[PDB]
Write a protein that binds this ligand. Structure first.
Ligand SMILES: Nc1cccc(C(=O)c2sc(Nc3ccc(S(N)(=O)=O)cc3)nc2N)c1
Length: 294
């Protein structure tokens, strides 16, 4: 506000609205998130500070945080396109495997970094993965479910995407672990490969059941303790696990192996970002430049 000239509304994110803006003084171009109010947390405003010092090449830089006039502004380094747009633009031919692999690899580095600093993203999706002309991809819009929790929607009547939500969140787990980010990234990896959302649920239960229909209804054997989770119902339909080869054709076996590990039901068996970086799938990783139309 006042020190910035809104150039264009980029989107209506989760907590607020996001604008492309220019610092009327420095002339620097940035992404400005405006947050939705008579209290304002402290554990939050300090969860923010931790994010400011959280600097990594695969994490969008948080430049400034401005709390004024019952509004909270987060100033981020600006990137030119999100992965959702890039995937749509590449739908006819598909993103070449080397670029998919590079993006996945960089995103795992970003996650390995935040997770080692005990920071969870919580809401990874194509729209919050930003890319630039140099072939980089960065994590954006980290969620503070440990600050603003997660109400009925985003901030003003808008359908929240559940497509990338880990099963343990859907089943009512109160405490998320870093594993929820691995699950979301696995769903994104699959989507880049097939050019179709892996689990496109339109409600929590439909989301949950689409996961069950593909990976099999979980039980105590593959997920110890699953039947005692908050929203688990013995009445859940029992679907058999589908052949994984039908899930992401024509991804090679290394890629399928890695994906299967990112999609393990048990949060404790799900591969970590660090371990995923060492998977054979990345033996030939490179950093190609994407063809971006801006
Ligand atoms: N989703 C989300 C929510 C809150 C903040 C941010 C964010 O920090 C952004 S958003 C952006 N630019 C951009 C994004 C999308 C497009 S698009 N649809 O491809 O044309 C173009 C530029 N840059 C940064 N840093 C991102």
């Amino acid at each position: 506000m006042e020190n910035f000239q809104k150039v264009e509304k980029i989107g209506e994110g989760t907590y607020g609205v996001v604008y492309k803006a220019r610092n009327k003084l420095t002339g620097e171009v940035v992404a400005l998130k405006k947050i939705r109010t008579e209290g304002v947390p402290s554990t939050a405003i300090r969860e923010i500070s931790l994010l400011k010092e959280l600097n990594h090449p695969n994490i969008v830089k948080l430049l400034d945080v401005i709390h004024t006039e019952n509004k909270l502004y987060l100033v981020f380094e600006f990137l030119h396109q999100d992965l959702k747009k890039f995937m749509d633009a590449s739908a006819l031919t598909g993103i070449p495997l080397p670029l998919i692999k590079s993006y996945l690899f960089q995103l795992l580095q970003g996650l390995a970094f935040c997770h080692s600093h005990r920071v969870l993203h919580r809401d990874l999706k194509p729209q919050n993965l930003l890319i630039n002309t140099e072939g980089a991809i960065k994590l954006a819009d980290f969620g503070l479910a440990r600050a603003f929790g997660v109400p009925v929607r985003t901030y003003t009547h808008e359908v929240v995407t559940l497509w990338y939500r880990a099963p343990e969140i859907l089943l009512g787990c109160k405490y998320y672990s870093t594993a929820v980010d691995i699950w979301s990234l696995g769903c994104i990896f699959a989507e880049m490969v097939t050019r179709r959302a892996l689990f496109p649920g339109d409600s929590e239960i439909d989301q949950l059941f689409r996961i069950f229909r593909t990976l099999g209804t979980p039980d105590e054997v593959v997920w110890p303790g699953v039947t005692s989770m908050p929203d688990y119902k013995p009445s859940f339909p029992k679907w058999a696990r589908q052949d994984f080869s039908k899930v992401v054709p024509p991804l090679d076996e290394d890629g399928r192996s890695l994906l299967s590990q990112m999609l393990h039901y048990d949060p404790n068996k799900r591969i970590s970002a660090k371990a995923a970086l060492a998977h054979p799938f990345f033996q030939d990783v490179t950093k190609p430049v994407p063809h971006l139309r801006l």
